[PDB]
Amino acid sequence: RTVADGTFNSMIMPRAVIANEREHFMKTRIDKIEHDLNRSAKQEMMDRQSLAEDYNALNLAVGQEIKLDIATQHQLNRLGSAMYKADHERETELTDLINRIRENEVTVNGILENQKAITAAERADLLLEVVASTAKSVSAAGRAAADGSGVVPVFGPSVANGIKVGIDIADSVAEAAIAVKESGIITQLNDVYHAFQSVHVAPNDVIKPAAVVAGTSTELIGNLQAIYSRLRSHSDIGFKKATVGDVIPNSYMIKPVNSTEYASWQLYVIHPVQGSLGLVVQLMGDALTYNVFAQYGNTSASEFGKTVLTGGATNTALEGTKVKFQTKVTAQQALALTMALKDAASMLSQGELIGYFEQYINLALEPDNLSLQDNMHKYHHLLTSQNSPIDWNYHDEEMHKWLDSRKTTNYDAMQKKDGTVIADIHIPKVFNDLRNTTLHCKLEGKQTIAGYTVYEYLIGPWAHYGDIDYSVVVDTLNEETKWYCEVIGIDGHLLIEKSVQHKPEKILELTVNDSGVTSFNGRNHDRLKLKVYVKDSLSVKVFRNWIGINAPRVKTKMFNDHIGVKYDYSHFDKNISPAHLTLTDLGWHTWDQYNAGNWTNIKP
Amino acid sequence: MDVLSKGSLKELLAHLEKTPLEEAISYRIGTVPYQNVLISRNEYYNQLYPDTTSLIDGVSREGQRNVNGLIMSIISYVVSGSGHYIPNIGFMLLRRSILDILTKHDTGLVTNNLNYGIIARNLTVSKMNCEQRKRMLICFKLLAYKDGNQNDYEIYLNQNIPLKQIAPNFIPGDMRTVIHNQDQLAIVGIPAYRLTQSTELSIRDDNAKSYKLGYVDWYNSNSFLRERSEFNL
Amino acid sequence: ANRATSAFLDNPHPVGVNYVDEGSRQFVAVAELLASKLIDSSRESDESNSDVPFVQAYSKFADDNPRHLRVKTGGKMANALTNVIRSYYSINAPAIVPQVEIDRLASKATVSGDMYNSYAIFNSVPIVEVLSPARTTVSIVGSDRADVTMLNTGAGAANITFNFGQIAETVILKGSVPFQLARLNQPMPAARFTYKLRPLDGPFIVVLPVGNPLVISATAATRIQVPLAFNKALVESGFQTAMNDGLFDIQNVNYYSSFDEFIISQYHAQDGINRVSTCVILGLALQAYDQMRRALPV
Amino acid sequence: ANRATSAFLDNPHPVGVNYVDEGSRQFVAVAELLASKLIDSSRESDESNSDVPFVQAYSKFADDNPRHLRVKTGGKMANALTNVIRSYYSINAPAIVPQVEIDRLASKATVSGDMYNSYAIFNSVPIVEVLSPARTTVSIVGSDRADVTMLNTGAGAANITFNFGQIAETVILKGSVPFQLARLNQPMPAARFTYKLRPLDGPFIVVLPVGNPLVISATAATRIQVPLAFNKALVESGFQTAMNDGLFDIQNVNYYSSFDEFIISQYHAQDGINRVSTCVILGLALQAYDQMRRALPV
Amino acid sequence: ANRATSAFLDNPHPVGVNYVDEGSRQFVAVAELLASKLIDSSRESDESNSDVPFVQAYSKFADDNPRHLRVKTGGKMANALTNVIRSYYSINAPAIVPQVEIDRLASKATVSGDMYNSYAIFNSVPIVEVLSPARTTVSIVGSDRADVTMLNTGAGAANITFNFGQIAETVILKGSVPFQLARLNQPMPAARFTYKLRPLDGPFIVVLPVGNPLVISATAATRIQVPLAFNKALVESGFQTAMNDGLFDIQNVNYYSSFDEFIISQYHAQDGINRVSTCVILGLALQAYDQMRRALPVR
């Protein structure tokens, strides 16, 4: 081997994607293209007429109706529906992954105990291979390749393009004037959308923190559910921030006006839309300092709230150029890398510190350094676990109590300036939380059995308790058809047949208790699976609504709660063949009444 | 051994004027640095002694073919006594003096892109003593003033406060500063009689100890052996 | 499963790599010898009703005569001794003392500077890991005497694993009530109060019956080679004095209750035998610091 | 709210107000010097075969030539030293020895009466108060090493306030598990195993999570000005001998496990500085008591 | 009723009955005196840069001139001292040192074999027994400072009986919270933080109220007659050294963390007045052993 130059080593160095203008321009364009490829404005605007009719046909009580004819309500619906669909897809994948681990619990246990010296990245690949994961890559390139259409994060500026803003009617109460008023949104809503970008974490990224310390398969499943309980709680808060009538701050980085080669500083301020806490990172030479601050209770004078975790002294009064960026990682993930980078500041160079941080925050790119990667995932587990330095439940509850107080204040302020009718236009009371509001989730089907396409919808888990209704809308080319709905539980399924088109037909009524569980046919279930079979389908939509507006919320389940009670989801993979159904098979039938396989025909 | 014996800035600069770049480059293939190794120190311990290899050890190590490697080889010779293996540099460059490389533009070498922080980290400045650090800062100042980077050298010193306290008090290009300098830069000198023929635990300490003990013998016998080969050249 | 570790064994900070050569070792030994004479001369001056013995001792230590209107600081030797103590603790310390200054101070007296002529016994107990199953709680308190409190909540008896490292020479285990302990793959003996263990003999399993908590008191002894002038009483006093004077106040360092905990923690770090030699020289310097500062307070 | 405090800090009794003049301080200094020579003359006598070194030392101390068939109590110096120790401990103890007798015994040797030239390090932990919420249990055990066991049975995390006083110079906090601690109205940092604090900084707040109990071990170091002849090993031995010999038995006094607990408790009282001055003189007298009694056991 | 006792007080193994006469007592004192000269000479050799002071003292100790390539261990004197130490610890340890060897070594230096010239203070806390009612739990930890944790789960207040033996001179009791303690058949006083007790006064009763646990810290001091050359710091260092080298590894013997625990445990056993005399000679022997090995080390 000849002597090695430094040419190859400079190429693989991390780059500052935020500070560099060319790199930021390129990632904004790709993010826009990915959003436009999956969700098209022209298709969404065309679909508005059908959705407005479907929501009206749900026959909700007065004061709980959703009127998509109002511009503000339509805007909030498409942001919520896109957000909910991405979160819904992630839970379905996590449920699938849980089943694979439970099937191979003998071999998964062997990996967890025997192999501990190897890093999180290698252990994750070993676990994903031993199961039939259908997504066996933990690298960022593999994760991007194996991504669906609904997973793609919501791009806020694309949703807000072309909407009329600032319709003014002066002392006019007439019906014609009001109708024009409903057709536009205020400036505040436009600014909220321009600073909105959702973040959704794949199960493959979550497996690395979960397996870094766990020694048993049950240990691993509990960690996975604990993380996703926190993630889904933050998604609900993010949607609530757009409904309170207040603008949302945007993350920015401060850099010196005229940077010096040997004396340069970078200050990063992260304001995640999904979450209750923010992070401020300062890089002065080789010194890294951070301060975690609350995003609630902020006055108008100061953008930052009370700081809850300290990691040094960070100066937010530094003067320099401001660059706006959108974070693609959660507050927990950003803090995990920040606390790991502080430990390895001496070993790493100045450029590596800046490059590794900027790539993770703006591109969700794990650092190449194996030692740095391992330490970050250990901190990620700590912040999720019960021994976290941050009381996440306390901060999440205060954010909820701060947001609805803002809604009351902003609604009352507008009731004085203009009428109550105008206030209802711009601050709708129906929209509270991503899981509280009545929403629809379009279903995509890739499996066809005897000419019947299968559409899968996961019912639960529920962060709210009360009475909840589920409805299904079927659009088919044929003039007359029969479609079948199957609701799978731990023991048995339902097999409803409806044969109605273009109108929502209610399929399932549930009551959910304060712990989040429901009694489905005599057993406590935390979640159910619904499969809709339909011939020659065009579009299938599932509608979800609560009986009471602003339903009470179930406390978030931490790690101890998940391992306390175990539910079997292995039955969710079963299927029926509607072409071979007879009349006697319809209705509630338990598993004992079937043979091995043939879950559609009962034994004679 | 000659370079480590100089104890004043004006002696050190005079030595670099007469010393070609060839003496700062080794022809021994050596080993790759920054390697965690176990060495045998039987005077103290029965077990193997953990240590890490570095460029500023007294032993020649493999070097890179870039300009960064050549500057690191020069500094290692000044602070440790041995250079590094950089093959086929060139006959013309190897004939030039070390001071010519550091302080003159006629050599044909470009050093504007050098990062002083990176070079210090590669040389393990954290493990260097006060005398070694002062010698390294002398080489940085000479390189900085050649390239017009006087401001960068000052800013680099501000970031590293401990290096600022021991910074040499000489301005390149001014003869008055060199004349009145009162720095002490002697790594190796005539030993105090208290020194014994005993090993040291670290790689750096033992190699430095070897140079110290062999200085008395080198001082008496170097002149005749040098002249026996120098005459009739 | 749960893991319990001693507080003082966690994250030993890197130690200094300067002033560990033969010339610098002699200077620390010279300072200790001359500092001891300062204490003795002050006692002689008080008894003899003459300041002549103290003047000679101060002149040798400080290279200047004592003066009534000048503060007695110990001279340049005191400054050099203070600075080397800062360097030994952390690698981030400045380490600015010149080699010419160190060499001239080692010529004030003749001493070998050997740091392996004798040994000292250190009493800190190193519990690297205590592995406990579910439904059991384990707490570790103390360093010189480690008390391990274990509760069994589950239905049956539980097995608890104890790891004492591979450095400590002997470990004595005493329990509040008789208990069973045995090595891995060994039959359990009849319950008894006291166990004497060799830490190198693998992990130890303790049977925890259901019921009242069992408390185990652990004492350990480790031998570390030290110079003949080493005195644990004076080293301990100097360690406390140095912390109060701010000599150990550097960024990214760990603080310990005693020099016993400091030396054992550095021993148990990865490649910890490198650090143990530097820690002994630091202990000798603290022994000189205690005697010098007690004789010449500032 | 619940309040927990260290046992040895509670109700320090008033100390004596006699034998604190310059002549009385000289007597204690003379007694320590002449008692030290008594213990050294015994060793020198055994090394040789002559009792001459002991006879000279005893004659100076006791003002009488030693004789066989006599107990060798120590003469008038032993009697005077015993009575002044009684007077120092309590203001209720009578002052028996006259000032003329003190002055006569102070002229036997020429030593300075200064008692504040040097310093010493005392390691008693002054936990003045620990304030806890309603649903938390807090227990404090120990003086040299204080272990605080806290358990939270509430729904959420609780904040516990620690007050270490204003006299201690440094306090090192070690936890069974990593915990969060910060000053009043300050953000909490990440969980850490150890903390180094200055008690003058202010009251500290510890976050107590719900679950297993958290035990914090505290170690402190306070410097107190003492004579140069002060020796902690000798002072503590004399304190135990003083209590065993029953010269601390006075009505309405508080008893302590060690001299270190006695001096820290008085420092935290109302007139702390004045109380400590008398206690330091008591410490030197106890040091002389130990050396004298070990040479002359009666 | 439930009974709890200190761990270190349980089952003191018998001490040796050999090498306790005047001739053997002189040999131990001679060894201690000569070992002190050995450690001081090594210091002088370091300061003078000459081996003459150390060779001078090693010749007196080992009756042999040090030679290179031969390990310095202390000669025949080290062999006698090490084996005599083992015999003092346990009665099962053999007696293998001849009387001719003891007499010869005892004549090297002039010194008295007196082991009762002076006294020393030992801080082990003897808790012979703690008797508690049915619904209470009592735990005892520690030897130098004994913490007794008591929890009452019954309906009413319970009485716990404390027995501190008859040997200790004074016992100081400090509680986490104020508590009431009184002797047998004596009215209870007001709650107090601290109690100074005389163990000879009798069994002591503690009222344990229902509620949070009460922790009592106990410190004790006892006087034992020792020779003037006794040094507690040197004896304790030698005890740990003898344990590490394995001299105390004998069948059917009990192991103690400190010499303070060992001497107190033997004192409280039957015929403890006779046992404590042998332990004192062992302590002086361990002091000589500690100084001998520190002068002549082995890696």
Coordinates of C-alpha atoms in Angstrom, one line a residue, chain C:
Chain C
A1 CA -33.0 -6.4 34.9
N2 CA -31.3 -3.5 36.7
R3 CA -27.7 -2.4 37.0
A4 CA -26.2 -0.6 40.0
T5 CA -22.7 1.0 40.0
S6 CA -20.7 3.0 42.5
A7 CA -20.9 6.7 42.1
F8 CA -17.2 7.4 42.3
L9 CA -16.3 4.9 39.6
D10 CA -18.2 6.7 36.9
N11 CA -16.4 8.7 34.2
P12 CA -12.8 9.2 35.4
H13 CA -11.4 12.3 33.7
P14 CA -8.1 12.2 31.9
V15 CA -5.1 13.2 34.0
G16 CA -2.1 15.3 33.0
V17 CA 0.8 14.0 31.0
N18 CA 3.4 16.6 32.2
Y19 CA 6.0 16.8 34.9
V20 CA 6.2 13.0 35.2
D21 CA 9.8 12.5 34.1
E22 CA 12.8 11.8 36.4
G23 CA 13.8 15.5 36.7
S24 CA 10.2 16.5 37.7
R25 CA 9.8 13.6 40.1
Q26 CA 12.9 14.7 42.0
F27 CA 11.5 18.2 42.3
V28 CA 8.3 16.9 44.0
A29 CA 10.5 14.8 46.3
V30 CA 12.7 17.9 47.0
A31 CA 9.6 20.0 47.8
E32 CA 8.3 17.3 50.2
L33 CA 11.7 17.1 52.0
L34 CA 12.1 20.9 52.3
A35 CA 8.5 21.4 53.3
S36 CA 8.9 18.9 56.2
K37 CA 11.9 20.9 57.5
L38 CA 9.8 24.1 57.5
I39 CA 7.3 22.5 59.9
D40 CA 10.1 21.1 62.2
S41 CA 12.0 24.4 62.2
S42 CA 8.9 26.4 63.2
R43 CA 8.5 24.0 66.2
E44 CA 12.2 24.4 67.1
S45 CA 11.9 28.2 66.8
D46 CA 8.9 28.3 69.2
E47 CA 10.7 26.1 71.8
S48 CA 14.1 27.8 71.6
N49 CA 12.7 31.4 71.8
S50 CA 14.8 32.2 68.7
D51 CA 13.8 32.7 65.1
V52 CA 17.2 31.5 63.8
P53 CA 16.1 27.9 62.9
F54 CA 13.1 29.2 61.0
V55 CA 15.1 31.7 59.0
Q56 CA 17.4 29.0 57.7
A57 CA 14.5 26.8 56.7
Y58 CA 12.7 29.6 54.9
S59 CA 15.8 30.7 53.1
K60 CA 16.5 27.2 51.7
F61 CA 12.8 26.8 50.6
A62 CA 12.2 30.3 49.3
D63 CA 15.7 31.6 48.3
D64 CA 15.1 34.8 50.3
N65 CA 15.2 35.9 53.9
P66 CA 11.9 36.3 55.8
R67 CA 10.8 39.9 56.2
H68 CA 8.3 41.4 58.6
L69 CA 6.7 43.7 56.1
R70 CA 6.6 41.1 53.2
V71 CA 4.1 38.3 53.2
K72 CA 5.6 34.8 53.6
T73 CA 4.6 33.0 50.5
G74 CA 7.3 30.4 50.0
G75 CA 8.9 32.0 47.0
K76 CA 9.2 30.5 43.5
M77 CA 9.1 26.9 44.9
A78 CA 5.6 27.5 46.2
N79 CA 4.4 28.8 42.8
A80 CA 6.0 25.8 41.0
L81 CA 4.5 23.3 43.4
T82 CA 1.1 24.9 43.0
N83 CA 1.2 24.8 39.2
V84 CA 2.3 21.2 38.9
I85 CA -0.6 20.2 41.1
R86 CA -3.0 21.8 38.7
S87 CA -1.4 20.0 35.7
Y88 CA -1.5 16.6 37.3
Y89 CA -5.3 16.7 37.9
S90 CA -6.4 17.3 34.3
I91 CA -4.9 17.4 30.8
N92 CA -6.6 20.7 30.2
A93 CA -4.4 22.5 32.7
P94 CA -1.9 25.0 31.4
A95 CA 1.4 23.3 32.5
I96 CA 3.5 26.4 32.1
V97 CA 6.4 25.7 34.4
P98 CA 9.7 25.8 32.5
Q99 CA 12.1 22.9 32.5
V100 CA 15.0 25.1 33.6
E101 CA 13.0 26.2 36.7
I102 CA 12.1 22.5 37.6
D103 CA 15.7 21.4 37.2
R104 CA 17.2 24.1 39.4
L105 CA 14.7 23.3 42.2
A106 CA 15.6 19.6 42.1
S107 CA 19.2 20.6 42.9
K108 CA 18.3 22.1 46.3
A109 CA 18.6 18.6 47.9
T110 CA 19.6 15.1 46.7
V111 CA 16.7 12.6 46.5
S112 CA 16.2 9.6 44.2
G113 CA 12.7 10.5 43.1
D114 CA 11.8 6.8 42.9
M115 CA 8.0 6.2 43.2
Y116 CA 8.1 2.4 43.6
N117 CA 10.2 1.9 46.7
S118 CA 7.2 1.1 48.9
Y119 CA 3.4 0.4 48.8
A120 CA 0.3 1.9 50.3
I121 CA -3.1 0.2 51.1
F122 CA -6.2 2.0 49.6
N123 CA -9.6 1.3 51.2
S124 CA -12.1 2.4 48.5
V125 CA -14.5 -0.5 47.5
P126 CA -15.0 -0.9 43.8
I127 CA -18.5 -2.3 42.9
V128 CA -18.3 -2.2 39.1
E129 CA -21.8 -3.8 38.6
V130 CA -24.6 -5.3 40.7
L131 CA -27.0 -7.2 38.4
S132 CA -30.4 -7.8 39.9
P133 CA -33.5 -9.5 38.4
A134 CA -37.0 -8.1 38.2
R135 CA -39.1 -7.3 41.3
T136 CA -35.8 -6.5 43.2
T137 CA -34.4 -3.2 44.3
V138 CA -30.7 -2.7 44.9
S139 CA -29.1 0.5 46.3
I140 CA -25.3 1.2 46.8
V141 CA -24.2 3.9 49.2
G142 CA -20.7 4.8 50.3
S143 CA -17.2 4.4 49.1
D144 CA -14.9 3.5 52.0
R145 CA -17.7 1.2 53.3
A146 CA -20.2 0.2 50.7
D147 CA -23.7 -0.7 51.9
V148 CA -25.9 -2.7 49.4
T149 CA -29.6 -2.8 50.4
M150 CA -31.7 -5.4 48.5
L151 CA -35.4 -6.0 48.6
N152 CA -37.1 -9.1 47.1
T153 CA -40.7 -8.3 46.2
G154 CA -41.4 -11.3 43.9
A155 CA -42.7 -14.7 44.8
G156 CA -39.4 -16.7 45.1
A157 CA -35.7 -16.2 46.0
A158 CA -33.6 -14.2 43.5
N159 CA -30.0 -14.5 42.5
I160 CA -28.0 -11.2 42.5
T161 CA -24.6 -10.9 40.7
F162 CA -21.8 -8.9 42.2
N163 CA -18.8 -7.7 40.2
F164 CA -15.9 -6.2 42.2
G165 CA -13.4 -5.7 39.3
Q166 CA -10.1 -7.3 38.7
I167 CA -7.8 -4.8 40.6
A168 CA -8.8 -5.0 44.2
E169 CA -6.8 -7.5 46.2
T170 CA -9.4 -8.7 48.8
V171 CA -13.0 -7.9 49.6
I172 CA -14.8 -8.7 52.9
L173 CA -18.6 -9.0 52.8
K174 CA -20.6 -8.7 56.0
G175 CA -24.4 -9.0 56.2
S176 CA -27.1 -7.8 58.6
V177 CA -28.4 -11.4 58.6
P178 CA -26.7 -14.6 57.5
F179 CA -26.8 -15.0 53.7
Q180 CA -25.5 -17.4 51.0
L181 CA -22.9 -16.4 48.5
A182 CA -20.9 -18.5 46.0
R183 CA -19.0 -18.1 42.7
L184 CA -20.5 -18.9 39.3
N185 CA -21.1 -22.6 38.8
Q186 CA -20.4 -23.5 42.5
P187 CA -22.7 -25.0 45.1
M188 CA -24.1 -22.6 47.7
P189 CA -22.8 -23.0 51.3
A190 CA -24.6 -22.7 54.6
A191 CA -25.6 -19.1 55.5
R192 CA -23.0 -17.2 57.5
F193 CA -22.3 -13.6 58.4
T194 CA -18.9 -13.0 56.9
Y195 CA -17.4 -13.8 53.5
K196 CA -13.8 -13.2 52.4
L197 CA -13.4 -12.9 48.6
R198 CA -10.8 -12.6 45.9
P199 CA -12.2 -10.2 43.3
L200 CA -10.3 -12.0 40.5
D201 CA -12.3 -15.1 41.2
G202 CA -15.2 -14.2 38.9
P203 CA -18.6 -12.7 39.6
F204 CA -20.3 -13.7 42.9
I205 CA -24.0 -14.8 43.2
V206 CA -26.0 -13.8 46.3
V207 CA -29.2 -15.6 47.2
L208 CA -31.9 -13.1 48.2
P209 CA -34.8 -14.6 50.2
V210 CA -38.2 -13.0 50.1
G211 CA -39.0 -10.8 53.2
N212 CA -37.0 -8.3 55.1
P213 CA -34.2 -6.4 53.3
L214 CA -30.7 -7.8 53.3
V215 CA -27.8 -5.2 53.7
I216 CA -24.3 -6.2 52.8
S217 CA -21.3 -4.1 54.1
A218 CA -18.2 -4.3 51.8
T219 CA -14.6 -3.4 52.7
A220 CA -11.7 -3.7 50.2
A221 CA -8.0 -3.3 50.3
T222 CA -5.8 -2.5 47.3
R223 CA -2.0 -2.1 47.2
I224 CA -0.5 0.6 45.0
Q225 CA 3.3 1.2 44.8
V226 CA 4.2 4.5 46.3
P227 CA 7.4 6.2 47.3
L228 CA 8.8 5.7 50.8
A229 CA 8.0 9.2 51.9
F230 CA 4.3 8.7 51.2
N231 CA 2.0 9.5 54.2
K232 CA -1.7 8.9 53.7
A233 CA -2.7 11.3 56.5
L234 CA -0.8 14.2 54.9
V235 CA -2.0 13.3 51.4
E236 CA -5.6 13.4 52.5
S237 CA -5.2 16.8 54.2
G238 CA -3.6 18.2 51.1
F239 CA -6.3 16.9 48.8
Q240 CA -9.0 18.7 50.8
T241 CA -6.8 21.8 51.0
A242 CA -6.2 21.9 47.2
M243 CA -9.9 21.7 46.4
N244 CA -10.8 24.6 48.8
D245 CA -8.0 26.7 47.2
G246 CA -9.3 26.1 43.7
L247 CA -6.4 24.2 42.3
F248 CA -8.7 21.5 40.9
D249 CA -11.2 23.9 39.4
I250 CA -10.9 23.1 35.7
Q251 CA -13.5 22.5 33.0
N252 CA -14.7 19.0 32.3
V253 CA -13.3 17.2 35.4
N254 CA -14.8 15.0 38.1
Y255 CA -14.6 15.7 41.8
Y256 CA -14.1 13.1 44.6
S257 CA -14.5 13.0 48.3
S258 CA -11.0 11.8 49.0
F259 CA -7.7 10.9 47.3
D260 CA -8.6 7.3 48.0
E261 CA -11.5 7.6 45.6
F262 CA -9.5 9.5 43.1
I263 CA -6.7 6.9 42.7
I264 CA -9.0 3.9 42.7
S265 CA -11.4 5.5 40.1
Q266 CA -8.5 6.3 37.7
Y267 CA -7.2 2.7 38.2
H268 CA -10.5 1.2 37.0
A269 CA -10.7 3.3 33.9
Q270 CA -9.8 1.8 30.6
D271 CA -6.0 1.6 30.4
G272 CA -6.0 2.8 34.0
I273 CA -2.5 1.6 34.8
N274 CA -1.2 4.6 32.9
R275 CA -2.9 7.0 35.2
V276 CA -2.0 5.4 38.5
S277 CA 1.7 6.5 38.2
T278 CA 0.7 10.1 37.7
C279 CA -1.8 10.0 40.6
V280 CA 1.0 8.9 43.0
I281 CA 3.2 11.9 42.1
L282 CA 0.1 14.1 42.6
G283 CA -0.4 12.6 46.0
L284 CA 3.2 13.3 47.0
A285 CA 2.9 16.9 45.8
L286 CA -0.3 17.3 47.9
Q287 CA 1.7 16.0 50.8
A288 CA 4.2 18.8 50.2
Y289 CA 1.4 21.3 49.7
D290 CA -0.2 20.5 53.1
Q291 CA 3.0 20.9 55.1
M292 CA 4.0 24.1 53.3
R293 CA 0.7 25.8 53.5
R294 CA 0.2 24.9 57.2
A295 CA 3.6 26.5 57.9
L296 CA 3.0 29.5 55.6
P297 CA -0.8 30.2 55.5
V298 CA -2.0 32.7 52.9

